[PDB]
Each structure stands twice: as C-alpha cells, then as structure tokens.
Amino acid sequence: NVKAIFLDMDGTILHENNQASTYTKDVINQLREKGYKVFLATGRSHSEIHQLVPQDFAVNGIISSNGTIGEVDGEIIFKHGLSLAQVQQITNLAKRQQIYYEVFPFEGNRVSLKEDETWMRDMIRSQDPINGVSHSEWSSRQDALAGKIDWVTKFPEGEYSKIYLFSSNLEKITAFRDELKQNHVQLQISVSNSSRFNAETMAYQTDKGTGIKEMIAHFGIHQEETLVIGD
Numbered sequence: 001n002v003k004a005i006f007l008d009m010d011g012t013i014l015h016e017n018n019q020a021s022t023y024t025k026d027v028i029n030q031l032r033e034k035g036y037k038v039f040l041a042t043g044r045s046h047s048e049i050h051q052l053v054p055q056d057f058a059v060n061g062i063i064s065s066n067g068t069i070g071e072v073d074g075e076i077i078f079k080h081g082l083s084l085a086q087v088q089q090i091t092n093l094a095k096r097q098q099i100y101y102e103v104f105p106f107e108g109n110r111v112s113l114k115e116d117e118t119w120m121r122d123m124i125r126s127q128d129p130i131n132g133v134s135h136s137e138w139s140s141r142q143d144a145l146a147g148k149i150d151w152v153t154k155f156p157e158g159e160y161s162k163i164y165l166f167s168s169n170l171e172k173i174t175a176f177r178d179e180l181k182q183n184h185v186q187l188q189i190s191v192s193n194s195s196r197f198n199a200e201t202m203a204y205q206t207d208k209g210t211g212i213k214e215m216i217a218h219f220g221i222h223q224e225e226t227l228v229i230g231d
Contacts, residue, residue, distance in 0.1 A: 004221045067208045067211025068211065102144060173197055192207060
C-alpha cells in the first residue's frame with residue numbers, strides 16, 4: 001500500500017547535472033500522475049532548497065536533507081533550529097580544539113568567524129587530500145574556503161539548521177564527536193557524522209527520519225505507506 005514516494009537526493013546530483021535534474025523532474029511528474037504523493041529531501045537550508053529545486057518540480061513537499069525544515073506548496077510546516085546560544089557554545093568548543101567548522105543558517109551562505117580564517121585555511125593547505133580524507137570531502141572544504149563561507153565578525157541573530165565540524169586529525173575529531181555525544185542532552189542537540197573525519201550538530205532529536213515523519217504526517221500518510229528512495 002505505497003501512497004508516498006520520498007526521494008532522498010544529495011543536492012549535488014541536481015546542481016551540476018541538468019540531465020539528472022530533468023530526469024528527476026520527469027519522474028516526479030509521472031509519479032504524481034499515477035496518484036502518488038512525492039516528496040524530496042535535499043539541501044541544508046531554506047535558501048539551498050530553493051537554489052536546488054526548480055519551481056517546475058511537481059513535489060508535494062520538500063524537507064532539508066537533515067530534516068530541520070519542511071515546506072508544502074509554499075508554506076513552511078516545520079522548522080527545528082539551533083539557537084544562537086547553542087551555536088556559540090558548540091563553535092567555542094570547536095575553536096578551543098581548532099576543529100574546522102561551518103555554521104549553516106536557514107537563510108544565506110554558511111558562516112564561520114573571521115578570526116578563525118587563517119587556521120581553518122591552513123588546515124586545507126594541501127592541494128590533494130591528506131590522512132585518508134576522501135577526495136569528495138577535501139574538495140568540498142577547498143570549495144567552501146574559496147567562496148562559499150561568509151566570514152563574519154559575530155554570528156547573527158536567528159536560528160540555524162546545522163553546524164558541520166571537521167578535522168584531518170582523526171583522533172581529534174573522534175574525541176570531539178564523542179564529547180558532543182556525551183553532552184548532547186545538556187547541549188540539546190543531535191549529533192551525526194557522514195565520514196570518520198566530521199561531525200554535525202542539529203536540534204535535539206532532529207534528523208532526516210524525523211523530517212520524513214513530520215512531512216508524511218502532514219499528508220496523513222503512515223511510514224509503512226512511504227517508500228523512501230535514495231537512502
């Protein structure tokens with residue numbers, strides 16, 4: 001009894017590829033025509049969602065890849081963010097240990113503090129990945145340093161979708177991630193990681209699965225009636 005198809009798609013597939021993007025558009029339209037509800041999980045912010053998903057994608061709704069915001073036909077139906085206080089606390093811990101970090105507001109470019117630019121840049125000085133880091137992750141750090149980070153004097157007021165943390169030193173980022181997990185109740189956060197070299201923080205008990213659950217519930221659809229595709 002599948003009533004909903006949830007496409008979990010890294011925004012990289014939609015960004016560069018216009019062929020995979022047009023293909024995805026046509027698939028969404030075909031599934032809608034067959035009567036399915038169709039949802040997309042992609043992006044790390046509200047701004048990124050609207051950069052990545054053109055208006056001619058006939059989705060019933062969209063959530064960020066990490067479940068922190070959901071939009072349905074132009075209405076934001078939920079938003080689970082970190083507070084500024086939380087961002088200050090977590091980045092201060094990272095800064096003490098010189099852990100590279102990127103803070104993702106729901107609107108606008110990711111940000112890092114200007115005072116941390118030199119050491120963050122010096123971490124990624126090598127043209128090719130070092131210490132086992134993946135080429136994908138290394139090149140993402142290179143690209144972020146080149147032009148995607150806004151270097152701010154202070155974190156602005158508002159809410160944030162996530163913080164990304166990274167070190168080329170395995171032991172350092174492993175112990176830091178373990179420290180976040182140890183204190184995730186006190187800090188009121190969820191901790192995840194996509195490689196052995198990183199950690200990500202978002203609102204307490206919030207992740208892609210919780211976002212999927214809130215989106216299908218908006219449509220009165222049960223998890224067992226939902227086919228999640230793409231991971």
